[PDB]
């Protein structure tokens, strides 16, 4: 059934899982005609593929060639996203398939399970949660692999860098649902906040800050401030 | 015109006999149906005074022999039987018909209501959707799963509807997933018609049982099959247009036959608001439109 708030140790079992985020696949910029009629011209999106256990990230990018000639695009995206999920299952070894997807929008449920009929043994799973994950793109890292590419790709990372070593996987999705919850809040702001000092760097083959135990418990504290703010600034309160 | 005799009416009870009723008392005299038109399959059923738990009831078609109810205080039921001794039959009826103790199937000259219900339903295929070889009828109730409804649990007492699924491989070509889930033309003509069925009339046919099932026994799983065959075809792009033609007369006499008080548990407000607002034959079903919109505006 649905993912929730009393069912998210699941998430850290030892049962393969993974969340797809369609949010960031099918993007656009909307802008007037010479003869003042308004359209829209794509730009490069990607799928978000996480396992929240280990923090490896599939990121299939979305190259705008993808819907040139096609008609009724945001439908035509979430089947294209279930498309991509499908060959990306097939692609794994058997014992890295996983045994349950958790779709981060219920319109996804029928386009996924309809692609993933071969597997009838895979859980598709909707979410009552709220996650963050259309924020992905505010880490340069991420967006400037989608920005640039010429054609379909496929990126592999580690959303947790090397977290693990020192945290769980619950902490590290805790922590890294609270980085993106305060980009999608306010992006500018938190930014401010997390390379405040400049001592502190962004390894090559990281996409976070070198942050010690210390600043990370600190850091998640001004990931709170910003987001009950913002919730003020946005209510007043 | 054929007859149906019985032996008895030991129990109060309800027959039907197609969409007509009437109630019989705790033995009153009554020795059964007559005058009942040849050409067309029919339905005798039954609730019991006590227990409307359990309408059940029997198809048959009289060319196919001489039939009678006989009720069984074991069982518990009026059963319906086939005599094999023709002249014993017709003595039997004659006698009966000679004291007027039959009630006369009470149909109207100008009225086509139970061939419009019946058009392509034939014993031969009722038969294979309810299998009892050994019998030329077929029995039905309220309580009978269908062969889907046992995959989600006595197989001889199931009701054998051809399974429709949209979410299977059988309706989905690997590499047109979208197409074939938005457009079930393919699993329509391809897969149920030219496979399946055959041709659109059998199809038809088991649309027409299954409401029919539906509507007497208030069964389910037979309501189940009756959408899910409406909703294949509305669903499909590409549909012959005799048969989108035949669809909406074949809708519009089950809508006006239904009992008002019924549609709330019969009719699926998802399937009729999809298929006669959103579907791709929106336009195609003028004659059920409009009685559905004045006959049941809540519903849409
Ligand atoms: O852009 C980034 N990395 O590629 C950052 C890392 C911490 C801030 C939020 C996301 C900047």
Same mark, same amino acid.
Request: proline share 7%; charged share 25%; hydrophobic share 35%.
């Given at each position: 059934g649905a993912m929730n708030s009393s069912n998210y140790a699941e998430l850290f079992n030892n049962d393969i899982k993974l969340f797809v985020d369609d949010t960031n696949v099918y993007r656009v910029t909307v802008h007037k005609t010479f003869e003042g009629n308004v359209a829209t011209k794509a730009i490069n999106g990607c799928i978000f593929t996480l396992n929240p256990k280990t923090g490896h990230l599939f990121l299939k990018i979305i190259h705008t =060639?993808?819907? !040139?000639?096609? %008609?009724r695009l945001s439908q035509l995206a979430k089947w294209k996203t279930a498309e991509e999920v499908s060959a990306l299952v097939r692609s794994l070894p058997k014992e890295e398939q996983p045994k349950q997807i958790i779709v981060t929008? %219920? !319109?996804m449920l029928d386009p996924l399970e309809v692609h993933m009929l071969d597997f009838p043994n895979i859980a598709i799973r909707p979410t009552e949660l709220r996650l963050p994950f259309s924020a992905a793109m505010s880490i340069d890292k991420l967006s400037d692999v989608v920005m640039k590419a010429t054609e379909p790709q496929m990126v592999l990372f580690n959303i947790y860098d090397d977290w693990l070593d020192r945290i769980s996987s619950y902490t590290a999705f805790s922590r890294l649902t609270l980085l993106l919850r305060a980009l999608k809040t306010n992006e500018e702001s938190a930014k401010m906040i997390l390379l =405040?000092?400049?001592?502190?760097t962004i390894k090559s083959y990281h996409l976070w800050p070198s942050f010690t135990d210390e600043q990370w418990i600190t850091i998640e504290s001004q990931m709170r401030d910003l987001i009950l703010t913002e919730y003020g600034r946005k209510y007043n309160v | 015109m054929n007859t149906v005799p019985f032996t008895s009416a030991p129990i109060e009870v309800t027959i039907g006999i197609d969409q007509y009723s009437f109630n019989v008392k705790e033995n009153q005299p009554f020795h059964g149906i007559k005058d009942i038109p040849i050409g067309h399959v029919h339905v005798i059923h039954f609730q019991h005074a006590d227990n409307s738990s359990m309408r059940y009831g029997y198809w048959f078609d009289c060319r196919m022999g001489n039939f009678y109810i006989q009720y069984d205080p074991k069982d518990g039921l009026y059963k319906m039987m086939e005599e094999r001794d023709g002249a014993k039959f017709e003595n039997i009826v004659h006698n009966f018909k000679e004291r007027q103790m039959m009630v006369s199937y009470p149909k109207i000259d100008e009225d086509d209501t139970w061939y419009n219900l019946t058009e392509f339903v034939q014993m031969d295929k009722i038969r294979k959707i309810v299998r009892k070889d050994e019998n030329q009828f077929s029995y039905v109730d309220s309580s009978m799963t269908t062969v889907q409804e046992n995959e989600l649990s006595d197989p001889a007492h199931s009701l054998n509807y051809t399974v429709i699924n949209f979410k299977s491989r059988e309706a989905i070509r690997p590499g047109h997933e979208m197409e074939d889930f938005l457009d079930k033309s393919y699993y329509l003509n391809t897969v149920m018609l030219q496979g399946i069925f055959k041709n659109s009339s059998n199809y038809f046919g088991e649309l027409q049982f299954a409401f029919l099932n539906a509507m007497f026994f208030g069964n389910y799983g037979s309501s189940l099959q009756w959408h899910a065959m409406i909703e294949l075809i509305c669903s499909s792009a590409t549909v012959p247009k005799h048969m989108l033609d035949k669809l909406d007369e074949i809708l519009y006499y089950q809508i006006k036959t239904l009992p008002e008080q019924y549609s709330d548990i019969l009719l699926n407000e998802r399937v009729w608001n999809i298929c006669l607002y959103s579907s791709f034959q929106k336009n195609s079903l003028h004659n059920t439109e409009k009685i559905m919109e004045n006959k049941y505006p809540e519903l849409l």
């Open positions: =060639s993808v819907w !040139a000639g096609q %008609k929008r %219920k !319109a =405040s000092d400049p001592t502190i | -």
